């Protein structure tokens, strides 16, 4: 809701470095937007994001206070949805992200690339 907006604002604030300096690391992750009944796919989406930004690697890449705020927003959204093929496509998508970070050795730029990609997939899936 304003929860989606808050989530995006927190991701924006988490940025550590200039995106211009990271252009070389950009990568088409092929987010399967055609998957966006759909609530369960959204929940799986958000849960995967929660897990992605919960690794020891995410903890080293991002500000801890913003991470708490971000976690709080994802948790609240999942609560709101719980209450209420595709999922496999989302899972593969997050596998592609995870592999990307590995190959890149979790570089500062690879992390900006993933942060910006998550903003995109989150805004697409929740609009």
């Amino acid at each position: 809701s304003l929860g989606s907006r808050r989530t995006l604002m927190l991701l924006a604030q988490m940025r550590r470095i200039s995106l211009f300096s990271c252009l070389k690391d950009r990568h088409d992750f092929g987010f399967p937007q055609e998957e966006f009944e759909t609530i369960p796919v959204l929940a799986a989406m958000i849960a995967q994001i929660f897990n992605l930004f919960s690794t020891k690697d995410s903890s080293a890449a991002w500000d801890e206070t913003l991470l708490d705020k971000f976690y709080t927003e994802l948790y609240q959204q999942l609560n709101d949805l719980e209450a209420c093929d595709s999922i496999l496509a989302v899972r593969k998508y997050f596998q592609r992200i995870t592999l990307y970070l590995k190959e890149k050795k979790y570089s500062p730029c690879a992390w900006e690339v993933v942060r910006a990609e998550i903003m995109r997939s989150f805004s697409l899936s929740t609009n």
Binding site: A12, L19, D28, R120
Partner: protein, 180 residues
């Protein structure tokens, strides 16, 4: 460089200010790309070697779902460049529409000037103010849009402000009238 990205009459306008002042007008070139694909920086055609300190990105920035990355090159014989990134749903400031009012015996016609797709979830707010109290009207956007503030009284100054609401808002200057 300092950058501002503003929606004005539904046109996305990127503007910038420089730290120092060139005695002959600076020439600018604006290039941008997005993060989601490894595409080359692209020059914005109506913003290539220009003396204007803004660029209309309406036809370029079609989506609210991309991280936009900009590079501004300037020739002030000093060559400088500045980069920035934008997420439109967050960074875009929504400037208020132009409007007119006409006071009638017991009501005010408020006419808001919109132009004749659209990517933002915006609401129009019409503020009515009198005797130190402000009331918000949110009418249920293309062309002139009329809204009537009714049940008003003589010998009373009313001040109207309008704005678009998406965050902090940017309100129009006041237009005020007593009823005839």
């Amino acid at each position: 460089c300092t950058f501002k990205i503003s929606l004005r009459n539904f046109r996305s306008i990127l503007s910038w200010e420089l730290k120092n002042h060139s005695i002959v007008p600076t020439h600018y070139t604006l290039l941008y790309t997005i993060m989601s694909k490894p595409e080359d920086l692209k020059v914005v055609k109506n913003c290539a070697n220009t003396t204007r300190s803004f660029c209309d990105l309406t036809d370029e920035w079609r989506s609210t779902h991309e991280a936009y990355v900009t590079v501004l090159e300037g020739f002030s014989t000093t060559l400088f460049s500045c980069s920035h990134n934008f997420w439109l749903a967050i960074d875009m400031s929504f400037e208020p529409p132009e409007f007119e009012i006409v006071g009638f015996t017991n009501h005010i016609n408020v006419m808001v000037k919109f132009p004749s797709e659209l990517q933002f979830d915006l609401s129009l707010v019409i503020e009515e103010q009198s005797e130190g109290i402000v009331k918000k009207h949110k009418p249920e956007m293309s062309g002139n849009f009329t809204y009537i503030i009714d049940k008003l009284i003589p010998n009373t100054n009313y001040c109207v402000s309008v704005y678009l609401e998406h965050q902090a808002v940017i309100k129009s200057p006041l237009k005020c009238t007593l009823l005839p």
